[PDB]
Structures are given as structure tokens and as C-alpha cells.
Scaffold this active site. Sequence first.
Site, short mmCIF file in Angstrom:
data_model
loop_
_atom_site.label_atom_id
_atom_site.label_comp_id
_atom_site.label_asym_id
_atom_site.label_seq_id
_atom_site.Cartn_x
_atom_site.Cartn_y
_atom_site.Cartn_z
N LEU B 36 0.81 -1.23 0.00
CA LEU B 36 0.00 0.00 0.00
C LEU B 36 0.84 1.27 0.00
O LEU B 36 0.33 2.33 -0.38
CB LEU B 36 -0.91 0.03 1.25
CG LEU B 36 -1.97 -1.04 1.31
CD1 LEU B 36 -2.59 -1.11 2.71
CD2 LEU B 36 -3.04 -0.83 0.24
N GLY B 37 2.05 1.19 0.53
CA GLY B 37 2.92 2.36 0.61
C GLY B 37 4.30 1.99 1.08
O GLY B 37 4.49 0.91 1.64
N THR B 38 5.26 2.88 0.85
CA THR B 38 6.65 2.66 1.25
C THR B 38 7.25 4.00 1.68
O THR B 38 6.73 5.07 1.34
CB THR B 38 7.52 2.06 0.11
OG1 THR B 38 7.75 3.05 -0.90
CG2 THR B 38 6.93 0.79 -0.51
N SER B 40 11.04 5.64 4.20
CA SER B 40 12.24 5.25 4.95
C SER B 40 11.90 4.34 6.11
O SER B 40 12.74 3.54 6.53
CB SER B 40 13.01 6.46 5.45
OG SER B 40 12.28 7.17 6.43
N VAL B 44 4.04 -0.57 4.09
CA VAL B 44 2.73 -0.94 4.62
C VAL B 44 2.10 -1.88 3.59
O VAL B 44 2.01 -1.53 2.41
CB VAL B 44 1.82 0.28 4.92
CG1 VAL B 44 0.45 -0.18 5.43
CG2 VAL B 44 2.49 1.21 5.93
N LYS B 59 2.16 -2.58 8.83
CA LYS B 59 3.36 -1.74 8.72
C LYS B 59 4.56 -2.62 9.12
O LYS B 59 4.57 -3.21 10.21
CB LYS B 59 3.21 -0.53 9.65
CG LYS B 59 4.34 0.49 9.48
CD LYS B 59 3.93 1.77 10.23
CE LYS B 59 4.98 2.85 10.05
NZ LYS B 59 4.47 4.17 10.54
N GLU B 108 -5.70 -1.07 11.38
CA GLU B 108 -6.99 -0.97 10.72
C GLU B 108 -6.72 -0.50 9.26
O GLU B 108 -5.92 0.42 9.05
CB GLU B 108 -7.75 0.10 11.51
CG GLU B 108 -9.06 0.58 10.96
CD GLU B 108 -9.73 1.57 11.89
OE1 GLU B 108 -9.07 2.10 12.82
OE2 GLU B 108 -10.93 1.84 11.65
N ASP B 153 3.76 14.97 12.82
CA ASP B 153 3.85 14.73 11.35
C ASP B 153 2.51 14.89 10.65
O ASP B 153 2.11 14.08 9.81
CB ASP B 153 4.58 13.44 10.97
CG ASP B 153 5.14 13.45 9.55
OD1 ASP B 153 5.38 14.58 9.00
OD2 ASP B 153 5.29 12.37 8.99
N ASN B 158 -0.94 11.49 5.82
CA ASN B 158 -1.17 10.70 7.05
C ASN B 158 -2.61 10.69 7.56
O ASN B 158 -2.86 10.23 8.67
CB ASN B 158 -0.23 11.23 8.13
CG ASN B 158 1.22 10.83 7.87
OD1 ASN B 158 1.50 9.96 7.04
ND2 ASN B 158 2.16 11.39 8.66
N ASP B 171 0.30 6.85 11.12
CA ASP B 171 1.71 7.15 11.21
C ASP B 171 2.05 7.89 12.48
O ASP B 171 2.02 9.13 12.53
CB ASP B 171 2.29 7.87 9.98
CG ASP B 171 3.80 7.85 9.96
OD1 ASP B 171 4.40 7.34 10.94
OD2 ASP B 171 4.38 8.40 9.00
N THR B 188 7.87 17.06 8.37
CA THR B 188 7.86 17.19 6.89
C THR B 188 8.09 18.66 6.57
O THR B 188 7.49 19.51 7.24
CB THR B 188 6.56 16.59 6.32
OG1 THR B 188 6.55 15.19 6.68
CG2 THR B 188 6.48 16.70 4.78
C1 LIG Z 1 -0.05 3.35 3.33
C2 LIG Z 1 -0.64 4.39 4.23
N1 LIG Z 1 -0.60 4.00 5.65
C3 LIG Z 1 -1.56 3.40 6.42
C4 LIG Z 1 -2.81 2.84 5.88
N2 LIG Z 1 -3.08 2.64 4.61
O1 LIG Z 1 -4.31 1.99 4.61
N3 LIG Z 1 -4.79 1.79 5.90
C5 LIG Z 1 -3.87 2.30 6.69
N4 LIG Z 1 -3.96 2.34 8.02
N5 LIG Z 1 -1.22 3.25 7.69
C6 LIG Z 1 0.07 3.78 7.77
C7 LIG Z 1 1.02 3.94 8.78
N6 LIG Z 1 2.24 4.48 8.63
C8 LIG Z 1 2.59 4.90 7.39
C9 LIG Z 1 3.96 5.48 7.26
C10 LIG Z 1 1.74 4.82 6.30
C11 LIG Z 1 0.48 4.25 6.51
#
Ligand SMILES: CCn1c(-c2nonc2N)nc2cnc(C)cc21
Lengths: 19, 337
Positions: B36-38, B40, B44, B59, B108, B153, B158, B171, B188
Amino acid sequence: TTYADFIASGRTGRRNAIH
Amino acid sequence: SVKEFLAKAKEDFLKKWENPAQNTAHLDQFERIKTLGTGSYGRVMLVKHMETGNHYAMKILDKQKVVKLKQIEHTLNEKRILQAVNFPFLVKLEFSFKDNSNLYMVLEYLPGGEMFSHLRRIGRFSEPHARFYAAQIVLTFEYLHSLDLIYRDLKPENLMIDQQGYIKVTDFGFAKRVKGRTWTLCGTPEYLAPEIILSKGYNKAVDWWALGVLIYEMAAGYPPFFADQPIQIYEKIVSGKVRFPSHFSSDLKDLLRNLLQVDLTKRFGNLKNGVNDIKNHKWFATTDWIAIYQRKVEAPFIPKFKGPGDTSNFDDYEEEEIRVSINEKCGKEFSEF
Ligand SMILES: CCn1c(-c2nonc2N)nc2cnc(C)cc21
């Protein structure tokens, strides 16, 4: 316009936390 | 009353803060779906918990990389705080655990995605739309700050949008429980308060400055201080100057001059009346604080629902393996995780 300046900038994507 | 609600919230938080939950699941209990995301911090991943069929956002942090980035204490803060908090606008930490190589925080999942993607695509939010989101952050910071927690942050990246169109802050990588001042340079660039850039001891007032940046960005479609490089952003922040779009209402500009206030004896959220200076501002006159908390207000936007495991609201990322070494890494550093 300020919008055009923002859109042409290198910081319109997701922004990283600093290190 | 607000005092009574926060007192009970503190009693609940302290019990968990003093005796944190640890090792509540295992990697083998989850099916890996998609990244879902990346960043440093690591990545996730969307996962499915086989025993329930629930989807979660896992995460994953690499212990060795956390150590190299000097984020040990920050990562321990993130997990310790998340397992202890409980508020409608905060993403829930469902499970946590670690193995030889990695740290895992199972959160969640919000298929609605980040406010960031919706804000960039739509362009900007109208003032009532931006106010709806702003009110949830004001209440969330009133809750967090009452527990001596500084968030550090705030940004659209976020803020997850749930199935009801409400916000969930995610986050907690820079959140910290601190009664006095603190000094870490973190956050940020666009959202840093001048006192952070200037290497001063700072407090919870940095979150209120960041709220000013967020409301501006939501209502304008771009931040109050932007440039191609962080240094140029910092010069703008510390200059003491800010320009507002002509479509900003007088009430919105007045609230933003008080949040984007370099003078700490004048910044809203940091005065004798605390958060009430914000809650009682003219821009928030139509906000029913209790109805927002109770989620009784009709949301201005509901993300398209395409299933509990759909990822259409997220960008695609290169899929990498989740490697688990046969040798324990950084055992002592993460002992309490
Ligand atoms: C990808 C987005 N994301 C999410 C979620 N993305 O979808 N549900 C989430 N909860 N939780 C995160 C915690 N820390 C970070 C850095 C990013 C996060």
C-alpha cells in the site's frame, strides 16, 4: 498563478519526513 | 464535560502505557496481498487475517534499517503510544509482533486511501469540506495533547478517509510522550514550525502550527510555503510572511494568521484558553463539536467503496520479499517491542 507554480514544482507528490 | 471526558481517557491510556501489549500475533496468521505504501520507515502491506477474513494494513519495519536511521526510540514510541490510545479519529493498532528481522504493526485498513490523493486529484476542498476535516484534527489534538503526546507529522499523506468519510490519523513514527520541551529535528518540510527549523526547544504548539498548514493546503490546494527544495521552504517559513488566495473567507484568513503565528505567546492552541481559542473561532461557528465526535455529521465526501480489500485508492509499488533471517537482529534494541 500560485496554482501553476505549485503544479510545475517538484513537491506535488507524497512528501517524505526529514532525516 | 470536556475535563471529565479527558480525565477518563487519561486513566484508560495510562493503564496501557504502563503495561504495553506485546507479541499479539504472528506473520503466519496473515496472507500478503499488496504493498500500500513505502518510505524510509519500511512498507505498509495490505494483508488478510485468515482466522477472521478481516483485511488490515501491516506496517513492516526492518530492524537493521531502523537502527541505521537512528529511529529506535521513535519506533518504540510509535508502538507504545498506538497500543495505548483510543479515539474515533485515530487508526487502530490491532496487533503487533516482531521476528528475527522485522517489526510489525497490524493496523486498521482504510480502503478509502489517504486524504492526499483525493486533495491532489480534486485540487482543493471548499471551506465547509476543509472545516469538517479540520474539526476532527482539532479534537484529535485536544485528545493527544491531554495525554502529553506531541504528534509531529500532520499532513494529508497521514490522514486516511474511512467508509463514512471521516478521518483516521495514521503514522505515529514521530509521536512522543513529553511533558517538557523537546528538541528533535523531525517532521515534513512544508509543515515545520519556525521553532523547529531554528533548533529551539519546542512543545505541542508545533502541532497547532501544522494544523494551520493543513487547513491552508486543504482550502487552497497548495501549501502556504512551497518551493523545489526544503532549504527554500525553510526560508519562507521563517520570513514571517504568508499570502492567502483571494477566495479565502475573512474568518479563514483570521484563523490562519493565528495558527501560522511565529510568536508563541500569540499562537492559537498555545495560549491560556488553549484549544478553546480555536474551537470558539468564528470560522468554526457552525461546527457542532459533539456531533463531529459522535460522527453524526453528514460527510461531504464518501470514497467509492469497491470492497474491503480493494486498493484502487492507492498507488502501485514494486513488490519486494519479506525476508526473515535465521539469526535474530537487534534483539536488545527492540526488546520492549
Ligand atoms: C499506506 C498508508 N498508511 C496506512 C494505511 N493505509 O491503509 N490503511 C492504513 N492504516 N497506515 C500507515 C502507517 N504508517 C505509514 C507510514 C503509512 C500508513
